[PDB]
Enzyme design. Structure first.
Site: not given
Ligand SMILES: C[As](C)(=O)[O-]
Ligand SMILES: C[As](C)(=O)[O-]
Ligand SMILES: [Zn+2]
Ligand SMILES: [Zn+2]
Ligand SMILES: [Zn+2]
Ligand SMILES: [Zn+2]
Ligand SMILES: [Zn+2]
Length: 219
Positions: A116, A200
């Site tokens: 990621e 986020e």
């Protein structure tokens, strides 16, 4: 319609906008994402949330994601992208970030990877990437903090802007080249399978991320 439910989604052209409240059970709160526009050139959307509890747990990653031809990272020429955004309430604990996944299997599920890559355009309230800081990286003549951590089979590099980049223009492939050249990233055997941009939230609110435009291509 707003997108309020946990995995409520909209697609327009090559852009998909997801509310993606994957961490909603980690705290208390709510979040709805509104799509303004989505065309072959770009997308505009906003998300508004309030979250408490689970101080160090991400509650969601409402995002716009790109549909593109998946290919080995070694065969990417450029990933030109722009992101123009703002938060109304910056008294929050949240990040604004690109999220990319790669895998050795092109048909890997797209919500996770062998690797990621995150590019944090902003960090508010001292929230921290997965893992620890391993370097200060120069990419395209800008300095980024470089963090690394792993969770199970997923290994995450996160590049973090020192000040919020509210009008970003860049080539995301510069970050892959950085990892390939300096951290042994296996470009010639990892397919890029996901490219997203969003936020986020950890805690705070009410707060609204307004994305006036997000554009990306994988070429
Ligand atoms: C040199 As290292 C901290 O990327 O193994
Ligand atoms: C050459 As290194 C894998 O420790 O980034
Ligand atoms: Zn509902
Ligand atoms: Zn896997
Ligand atoms: Zn794998
Ligand atoms: Zn593995
Ligand atoms: Zn390394």
């Amino acid at each position: 319609a707003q997108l309020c439910d946990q995995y409520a989604t909209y697609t327009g052209g090559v852009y998909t906008i997801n509310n993606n409240l994957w961490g909603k059970d980690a705290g208390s709160g709510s979040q709805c994402t509104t799509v303004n526009s989505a065309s072959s050139a770009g997308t505009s959307w906003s998300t508004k949330w309030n979250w408490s509890g689970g101080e160090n747990s991400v509650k969601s990653y409402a995002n716009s994601g790109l549909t593109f031809n998946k290919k080995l990272v070694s065969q990417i020429s450029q990933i030109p992208t722009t992101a123009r955004w703002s938060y109304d309430n910056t008294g929050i604990r949240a990040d604004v970030a690109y999220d990319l996944f790669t895998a050795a299997d092109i048909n890997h599920v797209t919500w996770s990877g062998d690797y990621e890559l995150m590019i944090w355009l902003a960090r508010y309230g001292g929230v921290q990437p997965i893992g620890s800081q391993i370097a200060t990286a120069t990419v395209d003549g800008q300095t980024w903090e470089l963090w690394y951590g792993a969770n199970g089979s997923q290994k995450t590099y996160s590049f973090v802007a020192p000040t919020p980049i509210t009008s970003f223009q860049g080539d995301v492939n510069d970050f892959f080249k950085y990892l390939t050249q300096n951290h042994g990233f296996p470009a010639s055997s990892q397919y890029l399978i996901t490219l997203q941009f969003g936020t986020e939230p950890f805690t705070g609110g009410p707060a609204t991320l307004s994305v006036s435009n997000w554009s990306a291509s994988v070429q």
